[PDB]
Each structure stands twice: as C-alpha cells, then as structure tokens.
Amino acid sequence: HPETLVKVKDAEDQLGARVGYIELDLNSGKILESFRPEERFPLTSTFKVLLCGAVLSRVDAGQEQLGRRIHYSQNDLVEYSPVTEKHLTDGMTVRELCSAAITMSDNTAANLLLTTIGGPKELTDFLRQIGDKETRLDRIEPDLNEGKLGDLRDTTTPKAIASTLRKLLTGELLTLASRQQLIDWMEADKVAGPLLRSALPAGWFIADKSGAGERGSRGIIAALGPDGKPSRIVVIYTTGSQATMDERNRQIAEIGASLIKHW
Template identity: 40%
Template sequence: MRSQVSRRHLLVGGALALTGTAPRPSTEDALAALERRAGGRLGVCIVDTARGTTTGWRQDERFTQASSFKLSLAAMILAEADGGRLGLGERLGWSAGDILPHSPITAASAAMTLPIRELARAAVVTSDNIAANVLLRKIGGPARLTAFWRAIGDRISRLDRYEPALNVTPPGTVLDTTTPAAMAATVSRIVRGDVLRPASRALLVEWMVAADTGRNRLRAGFPAGWHAGDKTGTGGGARRPIYVDLAFGGPRGRAPLIVAVYYKPVGTASAAGAEAVLAAVGRIAAGSVA
C-alpha cells in the first residue's frame, strides 16, 4: 500500500505547527482519514493527466470490478469496429433465458434484438446487464476481454464470468478483479490514449458523460462546471457489498483527472452512505487540482 509518510513530511509538518500554520493534508492522508471515518476498505487511484502524477490509497490491492467492467467492454467493442472486425450496425439478439434484472434498455425491446452500437451504449449509460452479456458472447467471452486488457498494457485486470455471477468474488480467489492503479491506467488509455480512433474515443466519452448511474458518486464531489463522465459498478451482495466508480473530470481546457475508486463498507451500510464516501473521494481528488 502506498501510504508511507516521509521523514521530510513529518519535519515540515512539525515546523508549520510551530509557526501556527496547519499544513494541508496530502491526498493520501485525506483518503486514509476518509477510510478511517467511514470504516471498511477504500481503494483509490487518481491520475492527473495534466501533471503526469499518480496518487491514491490501497491502489495496488485487488477489488471486485462489478459492472465497471462494462466500460472496458464497450471500449473493446469500439476497438473491434475500428479494426473492421465487427460492424456497429449489426443486430444481436437474446432470448427469454437471458433476461436479467437491471436491463432497462434491452427490456424495452419487444423484438429482443438491438444494434451493437445501442447495446454498447446501454452497457455504459444505464449499466444494462443483458446488453453486457450479449456483447461478451459476441466477442468470445470474458477471457477475450481479459486478453484485450493485456493487449493494451493492463497486466492485472481480469474477467472470468458473466453477469450476475461476476459481482461476487469468492473468498480466496481473484475472480473478476482489478486494482485501482491498473484500472485508472486502463481508463486513461481508452479515453486519452490511442487504443481507439478519435471518433470512437469521442463516442465512448459521450457515453460516459451521459451515464446516469453515478450522479451521486465521484461526479457529486466534482465542482459544478467540470467536464466529467463515469461508469459505476455495484456488487458483492448483502454480505460483501462493493461500490465502484471510474471517472474522468476536470475544468474545460485542462487535461482531466482519471479516478478509480472501490469501496467495501462494513456491515449493512446503506447505498446512500456508501455513495457519500465516493462523493467525498471526488472532492478530495478535485482538491488536488487547486
């Protein structure tokens, strides 16, 4: 865990205390304090793409991805389209046996078929579960998404199962997990790098901005007026809940922050309480820009 405080930090802090000026806590210190107040386990990685710096808390520890994998799935779909290996206008279907909860876009399709572009958008914007599984089958299954991560430089992230099983990582395994540092770097590559052609990258960013599942998470902590988008994940079940958000954000005209946050509350914490912790991470991240 990258949470050590240097001797120089302590000496400077002591000197400031003697002069009566309280030092501003580092981002790591602020995240550690938030975890202590909230309880549970908090993993965060903040990449400042303008400054080329990375900071966080428990950023090399593994966490369940839950539905946040759908952002990378959509990116892979767009990359496949960029390479001419599939067409976004191709229609994919599903059957009654594929029906899952939280599938607002696919559930509204009486024909049980939609174009790949609309399925990818649904997976990001509304976190549609049927759409995600249909797209996973199209690309060849979870192992193919893992291979995509490896191909773009992510040696950590993995997907092993389909919705809804992937939302719970069995104790003692690393199924369907990532680390904050690995995923923040991946998000940076797909929204800022050359993984996608410019038009596809712009489309993915557009979907993240339109996403409606994370309004109370990281983006709730970003200042009004920031250009921001995200993709959430919620899983773990009642016994091991996890709340995830992957976001970019920053003032217009400035290269954005990329933030990956994973929060495992203790006990039966409310969803509102857990989301408030993620919003607090957003405020801490935004404070690092000032």
C-alpha cells in the first residue's frame, strides 16, 4: 500500500540508509508492494531459515536425521550462542540445533548446521537448485555479519528471499512434515520481537526470522496473516545506518505497523 511506501521512505531518511521491502501474496506469489526489491542487502541471521530448509530437504531425502547428535568443542563457540554454550559436553541433535538457530538466533548452532550440509557453498548450491539465482552465503558466523561497503558476500535481494521463503513454506519443495517443522520453528515464542511481533494483532499468525549485523545491517523475513493463517510474505532489509539500534528497530517496526494498518 502506498502508505507503507511512505513509511519505508521515512525510515530511509531517519536511518540514513537504504531500506528494501517486498510484500507477496502467499498463495499466488503476486507482488503486492515493493521498494528497492532487486537491490542487495546482507542476509545476516535471516539466512538461518534457508539453512534449516536445506537441512530439512536432506532429511526428506533420507540423507540426514533430525535426531542425529552433533558433538562440538569450546573453540566452536562463537558470540551470541546462548543454547550451544550449554551443550559442550552432551552435544545437540540436528532438531535441537535448528530450533536454537531459528528461535534463539544461535550463531554456533548455525555454524554446526552449516557443517552438516557441507558449508556455505552447499547452501548456495541448494538455493540455486530451487531457483533462487541471487542469494549467496559465503561465510559462517560471525563473519557473514560484516556488512562491508562494496561486498557482495552473504547477500540477497528482498525479491529473491521472499520467493525462496514462499517455496520453503508452501507447495511441495519440502514434505508436509518438514514444512510444518520449519513453520513451527519460525512461529515459536522468542525472547524479544521488536520488528513485527510487536505490531502483530492478536489471533494473527506469524512465522518470522530477524537478523542483525555490523554496519547497520538489520532485516526480517516473515509469513503472516489474520485468523491464525499466513496470507502474505514480507521482507524488510536495511544496511549502512549508524543510528542507534533502538532507532533502527523502531523505524522498521513502524513499517510493519503500516503494513498491518493498511492490510
């Protein structure tokens, strides 16, 4: 809706940074609204959904087991690993790692899952095979959050990842069991949801993943809608701002508030 565009623009002005935005109809994939839809932005932790989609694709193919136990060491632990830092001695299952990576944004969990699939290039290959010609993962956590000016590594476009998310959450790319699992992880309650869950009406569905990185990078991918069912995909990204984190969050939250008001 045009009012959401005005709020996207205002966020650019307040944040001193580009903002990319797209809204898709979930059933048809129709573009309902867009701003800078084909510009590149860092994925940051939004990639963790794509990663767990690749894991689930392997589970469906009989190449991975959700109950397989992964053992790791102290040196594997990187910053912002609130779950994996509690399992050095006992390990974690693949299932547990995806839950941590998505719901807790656990960085080491994502690195371990990247090992399970064979690394960033294997994630990128999976994306190419499902028809995403843009998204790329090049590095692991935390390096992928760098947000360096003029660096194409670890980026997507709003349009690309919106379509990829739709593929993962609907249709037959994943089995029903695996779709539902991916949804369940993305819908689970989390500690703080400033970007969209703070705007979301009661009784609405949301399955989301946020991301934050260096150099102003911030984003969210989501499927949401009224009546306990998703009806739209929304993707919001920004990078480059040096405004406070609270201001970044607030500006993105206001885009969501607009989306909801003019739904």
